[PDB]
Amino acid sequence: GMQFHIDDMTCGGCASTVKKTILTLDANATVRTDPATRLVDVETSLSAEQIAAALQKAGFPPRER
Numbered sequence: 001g002m003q004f005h006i007d008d009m010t011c012g013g014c015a016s017t018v019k020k021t022i023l024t025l026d027a028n029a030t031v032r033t034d035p036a037t038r039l040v041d042v043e044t045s046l047s048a049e050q051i052a053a054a055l056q057k058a059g060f061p062p063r064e065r
């Protein structure tokens, strides 16, 4: 239960891409995105830095909360 704020995730198509990115890295992850708040909640066995690095490479640099 890690949370990120993703300033570039401003609508639905962005969020979809964020979610697909995470699910490709860990098919067992659960991911929630809220375009109103730009917040992304992730449950995963991977580290926050591994999730962040993947999101960065995809053009959605996060900030962990």
Ligand SMILES: [Au+]
Pocket: 009, 010, 011, 012, 013, 014, 015
């Ligand atoms: Au978007």
Ligand SMILES: [Au+]
Pocket: 029, 030, 031, 032
């Ligand atoms: Au999910």
